[PDB]
Design goal:
Structural class of chain A: alpha+beta
Number of strands of chain A: 9
PDB class: transferase
CATH architecture of the largest domain in chain A: Alpha-Beta Complex
CATH class of the largest domain in chain A: Alpha Beta
Number of domains of chain A: 2
Keywords: homoserine kinase, mcsg, Midwest Center for Structural Genomics
Order of helices and strands of chain A: HEEEHEEHHHEEEEHHHH
Largest sheet of chain A: 5 strands, antiparallel
Number of helices of chain A: 9
Distance between the termini of chain A: 49 Å
Chains A, B: Homoserine kinase
Bound molecules: magnesium ion
Largest interface: A-B, 28 and 28 residues
Oligomer: homodimer
Helix content of chain A: 40-55%
Assembly: dimeric
Entry title: Crystal structure of the homoserine kinase from Agrobacterium tumefaciens
Strand order of the largest sheet of chain A: 1-2-3-5-4
Shape of chain A: globular
């Protein structure tokens, strides 16, 4: 999606920011980096009904409490959103830093500290949004993919069915819950040098188990590109998180099961995208088997010490 | 193509610029918008042997003479280029402004003034680069596309052959020549408001007829999206150009033929790209017939007055 010069200039009169000097499309949503006579900005077109108030309101709340995350800029007319070339649109503050292509264990510690800080900061935010991608959503995604799963790997259907049944039967209820990011991968965390400078992209955020968000980050940050679990990174992540918000015995004990769950979650969306991408295109599509391999690894874990924490 | 944080930081120690605070992939070549503690910058990875010295050297020369175009930043080691993740790489100054999605005739006048200023400023630059996409290149492109041209439109082969033969037989020799941009479309010109703020992307630049560069801009700026020639824009463009560098009688007289030539040039690259893009992909490909239609229109022109200049 593109925007014209006059439309964007009109859009910016709804906000109190510099005058436009530059705008560039940058690498769901369309995003533009704006330069102005004041500060740079991010423009987001939502390529898209109470979810945006949740996401943008959460971002405000967290920023108001000191978290380094992007702040939605306020509109003159008091509305939450504008509109640009058909789509809902928001101006958002610009955070410095870059996401790490080759994170090291010391960075994972910063990530754990920041995730805990985010969990603590999210207290008092009262708009609710259930996780659309927990157990019930896994069942929907699987149901839609089940008959063609064996195209990805022979035996895949019979491997997954018992596991989804099991996770659903045992999914924990009585663990600390709050607002979680639910998608905190490498590309959603900024650093300036080795200091973490921000958390971005809260569009999967929702109310769910805090230790489930930890399990997403274990899956996201603590495995090597060849699939090897990296205990040095797992230790860093978990100790970093504990340094800010200690995990209970019940939370630590649940991590292997929760990590199977989050691994399955990414397996399932990747599987659905893989089966559903048109026959013969040149998007190279994410391999769902990466997350099946992570899921199997988590089944081997008898104690959180094995993730690196003890 | 992507770059890692450490590679880019090392790359920037070869230059005298701020420290890196941010980098973003932006919408041949891969381009990144860098923020630093000093000025913003553009990083270009050439997705690629004397052409870069020509292009980057031209950019330097023009900037040194006042033209608003991007300046290649100088390397500590005196070399012209660096290397990043396999590719040749250059840091380039950042120009403010945005390219016009909906240019009006008054903007076309600014474009004409700037093209003339560029032609005048390019005097004294002595590296030579022949146009690879003049008559000889048209013959190569056509030869490679000729047998499948009728797939785009019935009769296309027999329409083009006489025209390419004719242009080749009559292509003008004795018109003013110098360095031309050779690709000055809407997306290669920046404005801040209604003031033109820069010319960018000189990677088709070459030594050729100055009025041939004017004919590219007539083709690029002076037709509506429905194909209609816009005499108001043509007048603006040509009068703007004349206000800085008057065109001779011989140049004005040649414009219809030159415009057939430049129209054919874009027809041919578009045709080759169209035939050569894999069967069943979802890049929507540029229609070569747009430029066949422009070519036919130029055949109807008996006098430059009809483009709008008189
Ligand atoms: Mg380091
Ligand atoms: Mg205006």
């Amino acid at each position: 999606t593109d925007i014209t010069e006059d439309e964007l200039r009109n859009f910016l009169t709804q906000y109190d920011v510099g005058s436009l000097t530059s705008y560039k499309g940058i690498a769901e949503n369309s995003n533009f980096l704006l330069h102005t006579t004041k500060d740079p900005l991010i423009l987001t077109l939502y390529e898209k009904k109470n979810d945006l108030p949740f996401f943008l309101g959460l971002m405000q709340h967290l920023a108001a409490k000191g978290l380094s995350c992007p702040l939605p800029l306020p509109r003159k007319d008091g509305e939450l959103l504008g509109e640009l070339s058909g789509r809902p649109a928001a101006l958002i503050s610009f955070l410095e830093g870059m996401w790490l292509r080759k994170p090291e264990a010391k960075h994972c510690r910063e990530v754990g500290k920041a995730l805990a800080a985010m969990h603590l900061a999210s207290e008092g935010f009262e708009i609710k949004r259930p996780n659309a991608l927990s157990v019930d959503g896994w069942k929907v995604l699987w149901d839609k993919s089940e008959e063609r799963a064996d195209e990805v790997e022979k035996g895949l259907r019979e491997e997954i069915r018992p596991e989804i049944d099991y996770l659903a039967a045992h999914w924990p209820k009585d663990l600390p819950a709050g607002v979680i990011h639910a998608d905190l991968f490498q590309d959603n965390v900024f650093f300036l040098g080795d200091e973490l400078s921000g958390l971005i992209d809260f569009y999967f955020a929702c109310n769910d188990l805090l230790a489930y968000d930890v399990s997403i980050c274990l899956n996201a940050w603590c495995f090597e590109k060849d699939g090897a679990y990296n205990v040095t990174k797992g230790k860093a992540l978990l100790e970093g998180y504990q340094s800010v918000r200690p995990l209970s015995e019940a939370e630590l004990e649940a991590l292997p099961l929760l990590s199977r769950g989050s691994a399955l979650r990414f397996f399932l969306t990747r599987l659905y995208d893989w089966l559903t991408t048109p026959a013969g295109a040149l998007v190279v599509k994410k391999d769902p088997l990466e997350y099946l391999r992570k899921l199997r690894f988590h089944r081997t874990i008898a104690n959180v010490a094995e993730y690196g924490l003890a």
